[PDB]
Amino acid sequence: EKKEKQIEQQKKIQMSNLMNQARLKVLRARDDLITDLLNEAKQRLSKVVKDTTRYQVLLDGLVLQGLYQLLEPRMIVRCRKQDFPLVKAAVQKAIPMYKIATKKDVDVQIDLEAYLPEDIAGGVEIYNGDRKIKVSNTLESRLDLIAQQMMPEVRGALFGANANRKFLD
Amino acid sequence: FYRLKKIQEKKKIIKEKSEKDLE
Amino acid sequence: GGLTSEQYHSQVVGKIGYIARCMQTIDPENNLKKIREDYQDVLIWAEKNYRFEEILEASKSGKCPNDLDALSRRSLILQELLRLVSSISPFKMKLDLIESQYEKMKQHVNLWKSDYHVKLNQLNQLTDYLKNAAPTPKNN
Amino acid sequence: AAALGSHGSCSSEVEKETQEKMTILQNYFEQNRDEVLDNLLAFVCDIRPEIHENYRI
Amino acid sequence: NYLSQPRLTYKTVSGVNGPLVILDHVKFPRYAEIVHLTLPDGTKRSGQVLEVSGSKAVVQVFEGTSGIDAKKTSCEFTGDILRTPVSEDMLGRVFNGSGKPIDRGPVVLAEDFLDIMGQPINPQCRIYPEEMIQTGISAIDGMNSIARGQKIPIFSAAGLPHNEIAAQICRQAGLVNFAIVFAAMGVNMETARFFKSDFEENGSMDNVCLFLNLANDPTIERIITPRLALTTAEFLAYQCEKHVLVILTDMSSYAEALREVSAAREEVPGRRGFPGYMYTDLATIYERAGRVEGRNGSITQIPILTMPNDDITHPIPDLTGYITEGQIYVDRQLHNRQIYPPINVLPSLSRLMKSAIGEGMTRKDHADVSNQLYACYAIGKDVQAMKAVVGEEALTSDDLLYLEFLQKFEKNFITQGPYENRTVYETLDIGWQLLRIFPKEMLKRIPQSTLSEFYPR
Amino acid sequence: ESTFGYVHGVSGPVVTACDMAGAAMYELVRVGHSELVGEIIRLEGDMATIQVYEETSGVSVGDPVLRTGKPLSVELGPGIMGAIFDGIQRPLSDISSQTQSIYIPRGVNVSALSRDIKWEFIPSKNLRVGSHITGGDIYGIVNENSLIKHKIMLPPRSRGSVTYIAPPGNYDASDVVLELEFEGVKEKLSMVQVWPVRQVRPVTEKLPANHPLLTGQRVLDALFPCVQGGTTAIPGAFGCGKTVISQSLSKYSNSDVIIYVGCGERGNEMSEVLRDFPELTMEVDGKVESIMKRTALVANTSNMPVAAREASIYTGITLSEYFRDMGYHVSMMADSTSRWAEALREISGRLAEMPADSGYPAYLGARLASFYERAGRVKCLGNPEREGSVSIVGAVSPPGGDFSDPVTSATLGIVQVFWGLDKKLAQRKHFPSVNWLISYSKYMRALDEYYDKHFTEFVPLRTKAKEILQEEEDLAEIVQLVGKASLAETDKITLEVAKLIKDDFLQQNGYTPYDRFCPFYKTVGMLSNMISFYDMARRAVETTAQSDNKITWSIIREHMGEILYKLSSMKFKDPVKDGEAKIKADYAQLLEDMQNAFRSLE
Amino acid sequence: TFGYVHGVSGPVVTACDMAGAAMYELVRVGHSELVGEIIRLEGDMATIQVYEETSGVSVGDPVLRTGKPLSVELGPGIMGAIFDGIQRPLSDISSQTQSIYIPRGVNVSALSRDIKWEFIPSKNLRVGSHITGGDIYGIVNENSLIKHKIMLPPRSRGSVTYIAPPGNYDASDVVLELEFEGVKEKLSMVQVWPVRQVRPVTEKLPANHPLLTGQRVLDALFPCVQGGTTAIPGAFGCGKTVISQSLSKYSNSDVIIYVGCGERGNEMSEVLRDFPELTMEVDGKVESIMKRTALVANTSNMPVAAREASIYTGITLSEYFRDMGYHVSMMADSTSRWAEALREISGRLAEMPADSGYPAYLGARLASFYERAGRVKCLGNPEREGSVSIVGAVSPPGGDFSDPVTSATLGIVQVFWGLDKKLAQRKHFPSVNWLISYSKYMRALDE
Ligand SMILES: Nc1ncnc2c1ncn2[C@@H]1O[C@H](COP(=O)(O)OP(=O)(O)O)[C@@H](O)[C@H]1O
């Protein structure tokens, strides 16, 4: 009788663990697809940065977005070596729009002594004049920030809506 | 204990403020 | 049980590199063909001269086999065969016996619970005592 | 033998059902990939610079 | 919509003191926002801003402060409160105390992000709970009935089999579709295996979510552990209309985390050094229960707590007792005599038993049987206390029958197998077979009509 | 100057604000971009410290703080009856209707009374253009409900000559239903008046209290009576009955209206009231009606914001003082003064004020004192004389069940009635779990003037019943070390009769139809029978123990077992089915049965 | 590098120029190098709880940081050692100083340098080979019993750039060199580990085999598992030595660790006198049990932080041996004396009291210690199992188990060998009261 219960228990264990493994395989596969959507988004963005026209529009925004988050009288902008000429134009446009909207002056320098790594897809970092505080505006950081917040919209498209979610409380 | 501890913290704040008031 | 993700994937690429060392050490000639086939998926990542970083990226990417339970079971079976083949050092056993004992271990539920491992532990105690034994009747 | 005989197939059932679910995932994915990809690219590339609402003067 | 502004990161750690890091120069600090901290060795940690004042943000760090550095620490402020990613895909999964997965599955692909604190359920929209759950256990279903939407904890002395009772309720719970969220705060690994194993053995995984915070996991995670479990239960009940049961294990380890945090913060202490707000914080956990208007959903809760030194007047059981709808008690005076499950009826009550009984829910007699079983068991304990002074030779034959009732009662009503499932109707027939020990006229809690319909049968 | 400051800092329910030079203590503020309601609690220069009545999570430094210029205040008028309000006076029904949410959304500004409804108004007819008027003058009646004739009255600060009184018709809170002039200044008025909750509504005179508040319950009305206008506490551990007593007084009493304050209470109690009170009915003029028509709730459940517990209590008594000024016999329930005092503890701990005992603020005594003293019977303000009342029943919940708790100790310092519950009784399922040793009612000397007019038999019966229960508790201390056998037969009779009084009078099962309610005529009739049995049983022994023909408790019991059964059965008589005369006639027959049975022992 | 002392008040030393310092970092204060932990930071300033008596520390004294929190040196040369609660080597302090006293501010390296140990490199390894934390890169023959498995530190990983050939090497010789992400790590036999951090595992296994004591009552009626958590009511009248000596001589654990939690001066010297003289039969030879143990002794006047740390040191040692695939047994001969040391730290930190004057976190500091027991699959690739069994004595005043350290211990330990003075007075050795005592492992041992 004990040995019979042991055989039934071994069946239950094996019959069980297979279903858990299946559920995890499905979950991993779904997440890998979402991850690959984000990988293709990183690739699409890595094409967009090659157009100096749209990339100037990005840097004009990203620099000014940095300035408006830090609000200091003195700041440092850090970029890759290839970005610098576009960033100089962006800073030169951003300082006016900063002073207009904040009603106050700023001194901004570009960190040509210490560039971003060439592995970075593009965009900028910005720092206070003492380098003790920073804001991240690198294009990969922007993608992660919005992509992580939009995971519900991404899920609702790539795997459809959950039929059970009848209320939004 | 809690009352004596909170008193001791207020005294340390008042001492620190009193030294800052010398500047 | 659990680990930091960097720890978990580091242990994966460790166990791959160790399975490779055990497989090369048990068989410097590639005679144990049926056994080698049951590790080809891990052996390839060590037979290719990959840097630790490159196999680590492949582990995080799910290209390497990366279940530590499967790797530990598979690694265990291999090293307990390596202990058998190394324990009998003065008497190299036949290839058919090696693949037979491998199949019996592969078929077993848990090698740490197996009497196979108990017998090898009793042999290890006896053998390890002999390694530094002074001349005396008991030791001879 | 009855336990071993029942184990001798149920792994193939859950694996087949997993491969079915993986196909269903792949289908809904490919049906929407390019739209979602374009939408995330748009949300990321439209910067909208803002000063924090509590700013003074 | 998403927060579009890019995140600030600060190295301006003006100090560290106990579990607190004090940032300065912060641009418009937000109370209760989450910080992610990177230590000098590159370790990631998380924390919540407990106070803000001008440029300063006092962040409590969940993983503790050991290794935080006044220069080389980067504090990224997320600009928002802590949100749990939620989805129905969290059923069949296991998470640590901070809500990171540990089942070797991926992160939670959210259907939404919900504020971990939840929202106060509007008293006008709260439905009064009344549909009965059978737990399968006679000492519950016969004398402490649990309503669908009730919160009712299992109190226990330390080392009693409270985990087994709570596991058995997960196996046997049903109405006279369902899901479980199980949480444990500061559970030892030997017991964490028991809980995870039992759901795997019962085939329950496809409709249970586990949050495990182990007894060595960072003690501040215990504060968020039941809050994550509830935030998942709220998604499953209030958005997905699941019938949810939440189990919260050792609310004593939660209360210890409140006591530790209270010491570190220097809050005004209440009794036994717990914070003066322990009632409100326990309410912020416990009141996230019940049915809500227009929704078929429901959160049931059965919290469990180890009463320290067995003391019912201890602040943990006592404040829980004020907040929760009666309580189920487990006792050494049953467990030492091997009476599993060791549920002592006498201190037990279920506030919703005064509704989740009678026609359409249970047999008509149920209320009367329960009250008479309570009277006979209570008198049985009183005559036992008399026997301990004056001996059985001083007791009347009626008093000796209440002592014999107390024996027969424990041996048949409370005593039940760990997998034995009993219906409420079966439990009431056992109740009558025990009540039949007395002459009909002594049954002073039962009306003559209920006696005429049920006593002789 | 600015109408709004800026948040300097936050810690739990406490906010500190800059640019507050010219703020006032207890002034209302709106904090945060979502306009969280809060009240200034301390001043520190050009800076204020604020208590916020809504969860502060997400407030930021530099958020606006709009000063309102007003103290914490309730709108009084038509649309209170049957409502449920949150702790700061927002109707939860309109919050739900406007937002469709299962939760209260933070920062919501739903107007306290539903200004879209057209109410029916009858002007007082005496008043006319040029008439003199003063604060508390009833200028009209609004037919709010089938029960409550809502006596609209001039606010207590207002006075003058009537410039215009509106004709009979339909109106809302924006309509100028009345206009005054005073000192050459015109003053438009409508059927909704604002009042500051921390301020007591004045009265012509606080009258001596001299009419009982008949509760639902035998033990209360017999042994520890409350009075209309009385101050009462119900201290008890968890799971004693304190909510069920507060429910029972609200479901079944002569209070013309009830204001029920769910201060820090478990949320299911509010759903129980809203589920049960529309279904449960009183009767008036031969018409049955839902008891909700005479009740209003102020919810603030245990998980709702801590600070709002103060506002909840003050809101409940502000409403109660308003219905008192109309001349209604108000009752106010408060589900726990200790959970109120825990809000005072939390604010103190955030402000870093020095604690008294157990962390409670030193002003706890004064807060409770200035709460319970808002009770009484009153000669209302203004022209028509009315005898309003508020009766206040605070269900103190002492931590650990221990009555040494500072809130219990301060509460029992102030209240004239103390219904101390006991977990030993609740464990026995002896409900209501009132401990009849530790409890008292100081009003009994004033109520004896009522009983002597309407129930001349009662004062002897109350006295003997209290004495019998006391004598059994005196005997019990001996029995617990000697057993049941050594007692004299008179003392056996005392012990058994006290057990009958305990089990078949003090206990009352309010979830069963026969014990749901128990009128005074049933209550006194049961006492008359139990005490008639006691006196005759004692007399029968004392008459015969002088001889070998001695009657004993066991002789009485074995000859009178049917009479003992009849005595215990008296609780099952039901006023819903049995008429008053029918219950009385059954009890009169039991009295005659006892007399003939005792005559058969002589 | 170093900061300077800014102020001193009792053991509290405030230091300045400490801008680079970290919470719970270990600091040497004064010209005598007194030990202490940073308990607060307040800018470029740090507040150090100095362990040893600060008398003579001066404003402007040097304050040298160690690059580490409170940590145990792990390596060969542990067997036979005697340590204080903070891993200082009491035998070597004695032999170098030739003094009856510990000098205030010892800096003696915990594992004795200059001893060239016999090392055999793990013969499977090569230049370019992959390696992960817990890989056994060689074996050191430190004593006849305990072949010391040298292993890669749990956080280190990469490719082997070099391994030392077979030979004799001391703890400061670079035995391994490895590289990851283009960064080289040079590595020694000595390994440093943060004492309040759990050494990680592949998995904590369920415990399933008896820790045989060789004692009929203890093995038959109240079994402790290998990996088990257990307590003993260690008090004079009960004869506590009957368990601890029997475990030390006979029990089926490969290594033992003792923690003197904060014991009476003379009772400490009983342990330190006795164990050298005890012996075991191994393979028919007789050898001193000091071949397989280390004694983390502390008298009651050892520094408070050393007593409070001593329990964590003993388990951090025991976890290193567990990671070598050995079954350790750890004796902790008065968890109550450790809880007093913990209470003194809390009192000196001016923290609020909780139960009976103990700190709020007593429950957590006990529970997070007993959860460091158990069987494990080790980190690293040779798949080896191991365990620590924790035998932590309790000392309830008058036998009253409501004492919070005792009650919290009995709330956690799965086995309790309730020794009793009534049995010991009758010489009923092993003096275990079978009515009081219990084991929860009975179910798990059924296999
Ligand atoms: N008069 C009563 N009649 C019947 N049952 C009662 C009565 N009073 C209390 N009880 C029972 O005791 C329970 C606990 O008392 P309750 O008033 O609900 O707790 P609390 O005192 O904490 O507010 C009630 O919910 C009910 O089940």
JSON list of N, CA and C in Angstrom, two decimals, chain E residues 222-256:
[
{"chain": "E", "resi": 222, "resn": "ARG", "atom": "N", "xyz": [9.72, 43.00, 3.82]},
{"chain": "E", "resi": 222, "resn": "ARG", "atom": "CA", "xyz": [8.51, 42.48, 4.45]},
{"chain": "E", "resi": 222, "resn": "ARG", "atom": "C", "xyz": [7.41, 43.52, 4.44]},
{"chain": "E", "resi": 223, "resn": "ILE", "atom": "N", "xyz": [7.72, 44.81, 4.50]},
{"chain": "E", "resi": 223, "resn": "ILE", "atom": "CA", "xyz": [6.71, 45.87, 4.43]},
{"chain": "E", "resi": 223, "resn": "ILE", "atom": "C", "xyz": [6.01, 45.88, 3.08]},
{"chain": "E", "resi": 224, "resn": "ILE", "atom": "N", "xyz": [6.75, 45.72, 2.00]},
{"chain": "E", "resi": 224, "resn": "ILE", "atom": "CA", "xyz": [6.14, 45.66, 0.67]},
{"chain": "E", "resi": 224, "resn": "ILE", "atom": "C", "xyz": [5.63, 44.28, 0.29]},
{"chain": "E", "resi": 225, "resn": "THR", "atom": "N", "xyz": [6.11, 43.19, 0.87]},
{"chain": "E", "resi": 225, "resn": "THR", "atom": "CA", "xyz": [5.68, 41.84, 0.49]},
{"chain": "E", "resi": 225, "resn": "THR", "atom": "C", "xyz": [4.16, 41.65, 0.50]},
{"chain": "E", "resi": 226, "resn": "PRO", "atom": "N", "xyz": [3.41, 41.90, 1.59]},
{"chain": "E", "resi": 226, "resn": "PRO", "atom": "CA", "xyz": [1.97, 41.75, 1.56]},
{"chain": "E", "resi": 226, "resn": "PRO", "atom": "C", "xyz": [1.33, 42.84, 0.71]},
{"chain": "E", "resi": 227, "resn": "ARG", "atom": "N", "xyz": [1.94, 44.01, 0.58]},
{"chain": "E", "resi": 227, "resn": "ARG", "atom": "CA", "xyz": [1.40, 45.05, -0.29]},
{"chain": "E", "resi": 227, "resn": "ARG", "atom": "C", "xyz": [1.46, 44.66, -1.76]},
{"chain": "E", "resi": 228, "resn": "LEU", "atom": "N", "xyz": [2.50, 43.97, -2.20]},
{"chain": "E", "resi": 228, "resn": "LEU", "atom": "CA", "xyz": [2.61, 43.42, -3.55]},
{"chain": "E", "resi": 228, "resn": "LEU", "atom": "C", "xyz": [1.56, 42.34, -3.76]},
{"chain": "E", "resi": 229, "resn": "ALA", "atom": "N", "xyz": [1.39, 41.46, -2.78]},
{"chain": "E", "resi": 229, "resn": "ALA", "atom": "CA", "xyz": [0.42, 40.39, -2.85]},
{"chain": "E", "resi": 229, "resn": "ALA", "atom": "C", "xyz": [-0.98, 40.96, -2.98]},
{"chain": "E", "resi": 230, "resn": "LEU", "atom": "N", "xyz": [-1.33, 41.92, -2.14]},
{"chain": "E", "resi": 230, "resn": "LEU", "atom": "CA", "xyz": [-2.60, 42.61, -2.26]},
{"chain": "E", "resi": 230, "resn": "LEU", "atom": "C", "xyz": [-2.71, 43.33, -3.58]},
{"chain": "E", "resi": 231, "resn": "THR", "atom": "N", "xyz": [-1.70, 44.03, -4.05]},
{"chain": "E", "resi": 231, "resn": "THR", "atom": "CA", "xyz": [-1.82, 44.71, -5.34]},
{"chain": "E", "resi": 231, "resn": "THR", "atom": "C", "xyz": [-2.05, 43.74, -6.48]},
{"chain": "E", "resi": 232, "resn": "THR", "atom": "N", "xyz": [-1.52, 42.52, -6.40]},
{"chain": "E", "resi": 232, "resn": "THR", "atom": "CA", "xyz": [-1.87, 41.47, -7.35]},
{"chain": "E", "resi": 232, "resn": "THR", "atom": "C", "xyz": [-3.29, 40.98, -7.13]},
{"chain": "E", "resi": 233, "resn": "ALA", "atom": "N", "xyz": [-3.70, 40.76, -5.89]},
{"chain": "E", "resi": 233, "resn": "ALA", "atom": "CA", "xyz": [-5.05, 40.35, -5.59]},
{"chain": "E", "resi": 233, "resn": "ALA", "atom": "C", "xyz": [-6.09, 41.37, -6.06]},
{"chain": "E", "resi": 234, "resn": "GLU", "atom": "N", "xyz": [-5.81, 42.66, -5.91]},
{"chain": "E", "resi": 234, "resn": "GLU", "atom": "CA", "xyz": [-6.66, 43.72, -6.40]},
{"chain": "E", "resi": 234, "resn": "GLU", "atom": "C", "xyz": [-6.76, 43.71, -7.90]},
{"chain": "E", "resi": 235, "resn": "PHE", "atom": "N", "xyz": [-5.67, 43.49, -8.62]},
{"chain": "E", "resi": 235, "resn": "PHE", "atom": "CA", "xyz": [-5.79, 43.34, -10.05]},
{"chain": "E", "resi": 235, "resn": "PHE", "atom": "C", "xyz": [-6.68, 42.14, -10.41]},
{"chain": "E", "resi": 236, "resn": "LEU", "atom": "N", "xyz": [-6.42, 40.98, -9.82]},
{"chain": "E", "resi": 236, "resn": "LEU", "atom": "CA", "xyz": [-7.15, 39.76, -10.15]},
{"chain": "E", "resi": 236, "resn": "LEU", "atom": "C", "xyz": [-8.63, 39.84, -9.76]},
{"chain": "E", "resi": 237, "resn": "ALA", "atom": "N", "xyz": [-8.97, 40.40, -8.61]},
{"chain": "E", "resi": 237, "resn": "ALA", "atom": "CA", "xyz": [-10.35, 40.54, -8.18]},
{"chain": "E", "resi": 237, "resn": "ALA", "atom": "C", "xyz": [-11.04, 41.72, -8.85]},
{"chain": "E", "resi": 238, "resn": "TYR", "atom": "N", "xyz": [-10.52, 42.92, -8.67]},
{"chain": "E", "resi": 238, "resn": "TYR", "atom": "CA", "xyz": [-11.24, 44.14, -9.00]},
{"chain": "E", "resi": 238, "resn": "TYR", "atom": "C", "xyz": [-11.16, 44.52, -10.47]},
{"chain": "E", "resi": 239, "resn": "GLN", "atom": "N", "xyz": [-10.19, 44.00, -11.22]},
{"chain": "E", "resi": 239, "resn": "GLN", "atom": "CA", "xyz": [-10.19, 44.18, -12.67]},
{"chain": "E", "resi": 239, "resn": "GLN", "atom": "C", "xyz": [-10.54, 42.91, -13.42]},
{"chain": "E", "resi": 240, "resn": "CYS", "atom": "N", "xyz": [-10.06, 41.74, -12.98]},
{"chain": "E", "resi": 240, "resn": "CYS", "atom": "CA", "xyz": [-10.31, 40.49, -13.70]},
{"chain": "E", "resi": 240, "resn": "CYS", "atom": "C", "xyz": [-11.46, 39.64, -13.14]},
{"chain": "E", "resi": 241, "resn": "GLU", "atom": "N", "xyz": [-12.18, 40.11, -12.14]},
{"chain": "E", "resi": 241, "resn": "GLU", "atom": "CA", "xyz": [-13.32, 39.41, -11.53]},
{"chain": "E", "resi": 241, "resn": "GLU", "atom": "C", "xyz": [-13.03, 37.97, -11.06]},
{"chain": "E", "resi": 242, "resn": "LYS", "atom": "N", "xyz": [-11.77, 37.65, -10.75]},
{"chain": "E", "resi": 242, "resn": "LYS", "atom": "CA", "xyz": [-11.43, 36.39, -10.09]},
{"chain": "E", "resi": 242, "resn": "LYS", "atom": "C", "xyz": [-11.99, 36.39, -8.67]},
{"chain": "E", "resi": 243, "resn": "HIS", "atom": "N", "xyz": [-12.32, 35.22, -8.17]},
{"chain": "E", "resi": 243, "resn": "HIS", "atom": "CA", "xyz": [-12.60, 35.02, -6.76]},
{"chain": "E", "resi": 243, "resn": "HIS", "atom": "C", "xyz": [-11.27, 34.73, -6.06]},
{"chain": "E", "resi": 244, "resn": "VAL", "atom": "N", "xyz": [-10.66, 35.72, -5.42]},
{"chain": "E", "resi": 244, "resn": "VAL", "atom": "CA", "xyz": [-9.30, 35.61, -4.89]},
{"chain": "E", "resi": 244, "resn": "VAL", "atom": "C", "xyz": [-9.30, 35.27, -3.41]},
{"chain": "E", "resi": 245, "resn": "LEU", "atom": "N", "xyz": [-8.41, 34.40, -2.98]},
{"chain": "E", "resi": 245, "resn": "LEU", "atom": "CA", "xyz": [-8.03, 34.20, -1.58]},
{"chain": "E", "resi": 245, "resn": "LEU", "atom": "C", "xyz": [-6.60, 34.65, -1.35]},
{"chain": "E", "resi": 246, "resn": "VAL", "atom": "N", "xyz": [-6.37, 35.58, -0.43]},
{"chain": "E", "resi": 246, "resn": "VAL", "atom": "CA", "xyz": [-5.03, 35.99, -0.07]},
{"chain": "E", "resi": 246, "resn": "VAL", "atom": "C", "xyz": [-4.64, 35.38, 1.25]},
{"chain": "E", "resi": 247, "resn": "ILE", "atom": "N", "xyz": [-3.49, 34.73, 1.30]},
{"chain": "E", "resi": 247, "resn": "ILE", "atom": "CA", "xyz": [-2.90, 34.21, 2.52]},
{"chain": "E", "resi": 247, "resn": "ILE", "atom": "C", "xyz": [-1.68, 35.05, 2.84]},
{"chain": "E", "resi": 248, "resn": "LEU", "atom": "N", "xyz": [-1.60, 35.59, 4.05]},
{"chain": "E", "resi": 248, "resn": "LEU", "atom": "CA", "xyz": [-0.46, 36.40, 4.46]},
{"chain": "E", "resi": 248, "resn": "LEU", "atom": "C", "xyz": [0.19, 35.71, 5.64]},
{"chain": "E", "resi": 249, "resn": "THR", "atom": "N", "xyz": [1.42, 35.22, 5.51]},
{"chain": "E", "resi": 249, "resn": "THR", "atom": "CA", "xyz": [2.00, 34.31, 6.51]},
{"chain": "E", "resi": 249, "resn": "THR", "atom": "C", "xyz": [3.01, 34.98, 7.40]},
{"chain": "E", "resi": 250, "resn": "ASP", "atom": "N", "xyz": [2.81, 34.76, 8.70]},
{"chain": "E", "resi": 250, "resn": "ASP", "atom": "CA", "xyz": [3.41, 35.51, 9.79]},
{"chain": "E", "resi": 250, "resn": "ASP", "atom": "C", "xyz": [3.35, 37.01, 9.53]},
{"chain": "E", "resi": 251, "resn": "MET", "atom": "N", "xyz": [2.14, 37.55, 9.65]},
{"chain": "E", "resi": 251, "resn": "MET", "atom": "CA", "xyz": [1.97, 38.97, 9.95]},
{"chain": "E", "resi": 251, "resn": "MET", "atom": "C", "xyz": [2.77, 39.38, 11.19]},
{"chain": "E", "resi": 252, "resn": "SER", "atom": "N", "xyz": [3.20, 38.47, 12.05]},
{"chain": "E", "resi": 252, "resn": "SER", "atom": "CA", "xyz": [4.19, 38.79, 13.07]},
{"chain": "E", "resi": 252, "resn": "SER", "atom": "C", "xyz": [5.53, 39.21, 12.50]},
{"chain": "E", "resi": 253, "resn": "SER", "atom": "N", "xyz": [6.03, 38.55, 11.46]},
{"chain": "E", "resi": 253, "resn": "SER", "atom": "CA", "xyz": [7.25, 39.00, 10.77]},
{"chain": "E", "resi": 253, "resn": "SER", "atom": "C", "xyz": [7.05, 40.30, 10.03]},
{"chain": "E", "resi": 254, "resn": "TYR", "atom": "N", "xyz": [5.83, 40.62, 9.62]},
{"chain": "E", "resi": 254, "resn": "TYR", "atom": "CA", "xyz": [5.52, 41.94, 9.11]},
{"chain": "E", "resi": 254, "resn": "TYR", "atom": "C", "xyz": [5.57, 42.98, 10.22]},
{"chain": "E", "resi": 255, "resn": "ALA", "atom": "N", "xyz": [4.92, 42.70, 11.34]},
{"chain": "E", "resi": 255, "resn": "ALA", "atom": "CA", "xyz": [4.92, 43.60, 12.47]},
{"chain": "E", "resi": 255, "resn": "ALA", "atom": "C", "xyz": [6.33, 43.80, 13.03]},
{"chain": "E", "resi": 256, "resn": "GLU", "atom": "N", "xyz": [7.17, 42.77, 13.06]},
{"chain": "E", "resi": 256, "resn": "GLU", "atom": "CA", "xyz": [8.58, 42.94, 13.41]},
{"chain": "E", "resi": 256, "resn": "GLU", "atom": "C", "xyz": [9.27, 43.90, 12.44]}
]
